[PDB]
């Protein structure tokens, strides 16, 4: 069968502390007053939750309350966990409060307020100089949460939230987020499609915070190529068929060989023969003003097969694409 894998940084961050940090199903919740809080305006409703725009009547604060579905019991807890564990934390969405909804009956987290506006309604049009800034803000995030032992697992252009005008940014919707234990597999059905690495499109599952990388160099690419979505599969099979004809078929064939993974037999059909294609053939008059050999570069480090290869959020920060980034 599939042979082993270890995150190559932070492996051990989980087996040192004590069970109140990783263990979840035990923690108790400290519920807030549910009427410091009136809702304004239903701003989204996900698989999981419905989001509103509220006030925090109590200072007359803008937050944003999310709903929770009931759905699905210890997928509550682990998300409550994880974002107290990260509260505090570079560019992470604060958790203000946790309520009971009086209608669902079911868990309100409060958060701090941000903009209305995620990522994907920004990042189409931002410079050089902004994608490099907003890409180490982002950066600060994910080593941050790498750090405290946690995956995030959703890395996408809606999960970024963007107050363009001042220049911030958090990292939200940590619902699919998951403590990090070596030698543990987890389940594949997580990230979005056009965000999946290659080891959930494969069926590997004994992955790590690499996977957060891979998403975030499908971003990169996309916000450098000006490409929305940058590998557009029609569906998770046809998804690692558009990574294969830009990665190419060999590498793809020595990560499977690599960790003796079955690839499923659906894929001999319709994956084919494909070279490595060089960057340089996604470059166009439209946003040549946007790539640069650092950017390519860098991404090319974080675009790789082999999750164990990929650069890792805190060498991604020392690259040279952000030398030019104000620190
Ligand atoms: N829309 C929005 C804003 C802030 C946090 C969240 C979240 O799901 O964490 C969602």
Redesign the pocket.
């Known amino acids: 069968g599939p042979v082993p894998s270890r995150a190559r940084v932070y492996t051990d961050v989980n087996t040192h502390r004590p069970s109140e940090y990783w263990d979840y199903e035990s923690h108790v919740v400290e519920w807030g007053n549910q009427d410091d809080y009136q809702l304004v305006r239903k701003?989204?409703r996900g698989k999981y939750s419905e989001?509103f725009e509220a006030i925090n009547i109590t200072n007359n604060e803008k937050v944003?309350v999310?709903i929770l579905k009931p759905v699905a019991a210890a997928k509550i807890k682990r998300e409550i966990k994880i974002l107290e564990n990260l509260r505090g934390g570079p560019n992470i969405?604060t958790l203000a409060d946790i309520v009971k909804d009086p209608v669902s009956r079911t868990p309100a987290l409060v958060?701090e307020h941000?903009n209305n506006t995620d990522f994907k309604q920004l990042y189409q049009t931002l410079t050089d100089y902004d994608i490099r800034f907003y890409m180490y803000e982002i950066l600060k995030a994910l080593d941050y949460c790498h750090s405290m032992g946690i995956m995030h697992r959703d890395v996408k252009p809606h999960n970024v939230?963007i107050d363009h005008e001042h220049r911030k940014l958090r990292l939200?919707?940590?619902?699919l987020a998951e403590f990090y234990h070596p030698g543990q597999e987890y389940n594949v059905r997580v990230a979005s499609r056009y965000f999946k690495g290659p080891e959930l499109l494969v069926d590997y599952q004994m992955y790590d915070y690499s996977l957060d990388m891979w998403s975030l160099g499908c971003m990169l690419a996309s916000m450098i190529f000006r490409k929305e979505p940058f590998f557009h599969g029609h569906d998770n099979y046809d998804q690692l068929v558009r990574i294969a004809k830009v990665l190419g078929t060999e590498d793809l064939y020595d990560y499977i060989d690599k960790y003796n993974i079955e690839l499923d037999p659906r894929f001999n059909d319709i994956l084919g023969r494909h070279s490595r294609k060089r960057w340089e053939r996604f470059v166009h008059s439209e946003n040549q003003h946007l790539v640069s050999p650092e950017a390519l570069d860098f991404l090319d480090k974080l675009l790789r097969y082999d999750h164990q290869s990929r650069l890792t959020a805190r060498e991604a920060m020392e690259h040279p694409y952000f030398y030019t980034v104000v620190k």
């Not at 939200?172 to 619902?175: L, R, V």
């Open positions: 701003l989204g989001v944003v999310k969405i958060f941000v939230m939200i919707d940590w619902g």
